[PDB]
Write a structure and sequence with these properties.
It comes from Streptococcus thermophilus (strain ATCC BAA-250 / LMG 18311). The protein contains 15 helices and no strands. The protein is mainly α. Bound molecules: (2S)-2,3-dihydroxypropyl(7Z)-pentadec-7-enoate (5 copies), (2R)-2,3-dihydroxypropyl(7Z)-pentadec-7-enoate (15 copies) and sodium ion.
Length: about 450
């Protein structure tokens, strides 16, 4: 009888848990770059704005990378329900430390807490949604669609509420609101979950066997030791600026899939090779999409007349278009019975739309010059285009592909950590035109390659 939009009642709990976590996350993302600008302007943070942009990008990269690890830790060590709870606690702490009366000195600690916390929570709330359904339950896709609406809803309202709070009451109060958002999520999660969640998920479902503990320990220890060795050598040869560390994280984030690629190609060999263009297309798409909170956020603050509203509000456009497009594409893929495009073709076209979203942004500077301010509608059109691309590439991404798919966004963001340092008023038009055109061209290349990939 009683449901949450046709689904098991437990979905309401997880819906709200993620909505409020996404609220805390995207509330932070909407103001953190501006916060670093503020800390630079007061002389508390001694970096360039370019490096601040780089930080935003690599932050996102590590959050995504962390997400590829959290499922293992839940499934094999601590359980999905405690992963979500303690992940949320860590996330809340990460916002609290920025709410505290510190300055730049608290930034790194905040970032680490949220990287670890999001890694624990994000994959595992998704897992818990699955546990609501039997294997044979046809409602599963509908349920995840509803869950995703909650995600986007949280992403949508957070810049509005947290961004407004920031401009009125300051950054510390704004970060306190992010923390409170996660707290609300934890309250609903903790008390609601006890009502509907299977007790089974209080513990690992595939706990380490006795003989598995030592090898895992050796694996992790060697990884940490090597990473620390690299940092020691870096400091010895004088490569110890913040950009150097960001470069190290960039290399690590990119080396991970590259090593996977090199592994599989060495160790259906055709299939794996054919994924390379798809994986590259996904990386470049996520790169462009993830620049919304960095380069488009910069354009919004410097190049747009937003005198009458908080410029952080532009970050709401991304989840807004997702919500607006979704029922149309839901309809589209079911109504498109005859000659529906293949997944490789969807990637190509998706990459093209992302390219167009940047080519569009080259136009105001080319037409009006870069010294003035332009209509907010340029950014609206840009987000409209890139999200159109997301609708094509994202729903079939994991399908056509596993971890390397989830890694595509991490790698895209790591690429951004390098690229966004190139963006400024002098380079604006060339930046948008170059990377936009480059993306369209590779989209066109992928179209040429499409039939072969579809065959394999
Ligand atoms: C399924 C297709 C519909 C959804 C995607 C279409 C959205 C694309 C919009 C690109 C054009 C918008 C950019 C034009 C613009 O910014 O004009 C500014 C001007 O009006 C200043 O007053
Ligand atoms: C400034 C750097 C901060 C570093 C973060 C400190 C904490 C990092 C990792 C520990 C969190 C793991 C939480 C696991 C836990 O609470 O136990 C779960 C277990 O009891 C349920 O089976
Ligand atoms: C830097 C200072 C940090 C001090 C703040 C520490 C945060 C304190 C509490 C946050 C825990 C929220 C958990 C909400 C909840 O439902 O817990 C109830 C449950 O534990 C009852 O057994
Ligand atoms: C895993 C896929 C990697 C593909 C990355 C594609 C782009 C990579 C590097 C391009 C950087 C060089 C272009 C620099 C540039 O021209 O900036 C434009 C503007 O600043 C002035 O022209
Ligand atoms: C399903 C149809 C949607 C696919 C998108 C179709 C895109 C078609 C053409 C894009 C035109 C790219 C033009 C490149 C350009 O104007 O760059 C010039 C600029 O670099 C001058 O330096
Ligand atoms: C240092 C910050 C404050 C720490 C909060 C401590 C909260 C008190 C006891 C910990 C409760 C552990 C709950 C773990 C858990 O799996 O919760 C899930 C719920 O059962 C619903 O799935
Ligand atoms: C496999 C788990 C993922 C690994 C997480 C490692 C996270 C390490 C660094 C986070 C990247 C953030 C760098 C930005 C940064 O350090 O800013 C600090 C302040 O600017 C201090 O000057
Ligand atoms: C159960 C513990 C967790 C409670 C939820 C997190 C609450 C976080 C902060 C509470 C409100 C803090 C007031 C804002 C603040 O820190 O001062 C604002 C600035 O200091 C003034 O510029
Ligand atoms: C900065 C890296 C942090 C690494 C933390 C993960 C630790 C990795 C390996 C150690 C094993 C973790 C505990 C395993 C454990 O609880 O044993 C229980 C087994 O089920 C007993 O057979
Ligand atoms: C960060 C550097 C990498 C080292 C990770 C720290 C290792 C943390 C814990 C390893 C402790 C050894 C695991 C044995 C264990 O606790 O299992 C207990 C089982 O329940 C057996 O009764
Ligand atoms: C549980 C802690 C694990 C730490 C995660 C890895 C963090 C290590 C390197 C990532 C980049 C951190 C360096 C950021 C930083 O503050 O460097 C500033 C230096 O003073 C350079 O001026
Ligand atoms: C899955 C295996 C992952 C292995 C990661 C490989 C990392 C090996 C070497 C990292 C190279 C060190 C980067 C340091 C760096 O680029 O500093 C340059 C700065 O611009 C100096 O000012
Ligand atoms: C009424 C619009 C539909 C609901 C949007 C909720 C808020 C989402 C984004 C707000 C930030 C970007 C809006 C700026 C904007 O579009 O201004 C357009 C003006 O007509 C140009 O001056
Ligand atoms: C949706 C399918 C149709 C795609 C429409 C988007 C096509 C976009 C542009 C096609 C015309 C290219 C104009 C390029 C242009 O005028 O550049 C200006 C010069 O470079 C000025 O130096
Ligand atoms: C397949 C979906 C693609 C949707 C295409 C619809 C958008 C059509 C044309 C977009 C061209 C954007 C440039 C507009 C422009 O430059 O005019 C300047 C403004 O009018 C300023 O007065
Ligand atoms: C389907 C319609 C989507 C709208 C996107 C169309 C954008 C296509 C071409 C616009 C590229 C504008 C490039 C401007 C440019 O680089 O030339 C200007 C010179 O550099 C002088 O500033
Ligand atoms: C296909 C599913 C339905 C899509 C939802 C509608 C969103 C479609 C396009 C939104 C693009 C808004 C761009 C606004 C813009 O620049 O237009 C120029 C001004 O309207 C001229 O006054
Ligand atoms: C019954 C609904 C009718 C179907 C609407 C489908 C929407 C498809 C494309 C709408 C594109 C909106 C952007 C308009 C635009 O680009 O105008 C550019 C002008 O040059 C700006 O002055
Ligand atoms: C089989 C090897 C895989 C190749 C790795 C893909 C990474 C390709 C390019 C990395 C991006 C480097 C761009 C450098 C750049 O232009 O900006 C650098 C900044 O100015 C300084 O951080
Ligand atoms: C200034 C001249 C540069 C213009 C570039 C011209 C080439 C651009 C597009 C050619 C597209 C021809 C379509 C052929 C094609 O993709 O075949 C489809 C395959 O069967 C699908 O994999
Ligand atoms: Na404003």
């Amino acid at each position: 009888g009683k449901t949450f939009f046709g689904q098991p009642l437990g979905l309401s709990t997880l819906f709200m848990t993620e909505m409020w976590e996404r609220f805390s996350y995207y509330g932070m993302r909407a103001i953190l770059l501006y916060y670093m600008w503020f800390l630079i302007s007061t002389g508390d943070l001694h970096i360039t704005r370019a490096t601040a942009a780089s930080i935003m990008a690599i932050y996102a990269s590590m959050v995504y990378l962390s997400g590829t690890i959290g499922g293992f830790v839940a499934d094999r060590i601590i359980g999905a329900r405690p992963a979500v709870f303690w992940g949320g606690v860590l996330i809340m702490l990460g916002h609290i430390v920025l709410a505290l009366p510190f300055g730049a000195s608290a930034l790194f600690g905040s970032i680490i807490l949220i990287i670890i916390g999001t890694g624990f929570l994000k994959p595992n709330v998704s897992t818990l949604v699955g546990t609501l359904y039997d294997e044979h339950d046809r409602r599963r896709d509908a349920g995840f669609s509803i869950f995703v609406f909650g995600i986007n809803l949280g992403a949508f309202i957070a810049p509005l509420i947290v961004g407004a709070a920031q401009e009125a009451a300051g950054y510390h109060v704004a970060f306190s609101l992010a923390a409170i958002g996660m707290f609300i999520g934890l309250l609903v999660y903790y008390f609601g979950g006890k009502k509907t969640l299977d007790p089974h998920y209080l513990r690992p479902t595939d706990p380490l066997a006795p003989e598995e503990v030592k090898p895992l320990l050796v694996k992790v220890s060697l990884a940490v030791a090597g990473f620390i060795a690299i940092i020691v050598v870096m400091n010895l040869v004088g490569w110890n600026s913040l950009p150097a560390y960001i470069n190290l994280l960039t290399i690590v984030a990119i080396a991970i899939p590259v090593f996977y690629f090199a592994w599989m190609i060495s160790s259906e060999h055709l299939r794996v090779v054919s994924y390379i263009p798809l994986f590259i297309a996904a990386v470049l798409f996520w790169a462009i999409e993830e620049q919304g909170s960095v380069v488009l956020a910069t354009f919004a603050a410097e190049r747009v007349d937003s005198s009458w509203f908080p410029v952080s509000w532009f970050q709401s456009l991304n989840p807004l278009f997702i919500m607006l497009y979704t029922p149309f594409f839901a309809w589209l893929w079911t109504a498109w019975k005859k000659n529906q495009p293949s997944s490789p073709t969807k990637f190509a076209v998706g990459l093209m739309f992302a390219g167009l979203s940047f080519l569009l942004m080259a136009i105001p500077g080319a037409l009006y010059g870069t010294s003035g301010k332009v209509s907010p509608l340029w950014l609206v059109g840009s987000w409209a285009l890139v999200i159109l691309g997301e609708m094509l590439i994202s729903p079939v991404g994991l399908s056509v592909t596993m971890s390397m798919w989830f890694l595509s966004s991490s790698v895209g963001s790591a690429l951004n950590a390098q690229l966004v340092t190139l963006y400024n008023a002098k380079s604006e038009v060339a930046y948008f035109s170059y990377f936009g055109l480059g993306s369209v061209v590779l989209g066109i290349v992928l179209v040429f390659l499409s039939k072969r990939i579809q065959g394999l």
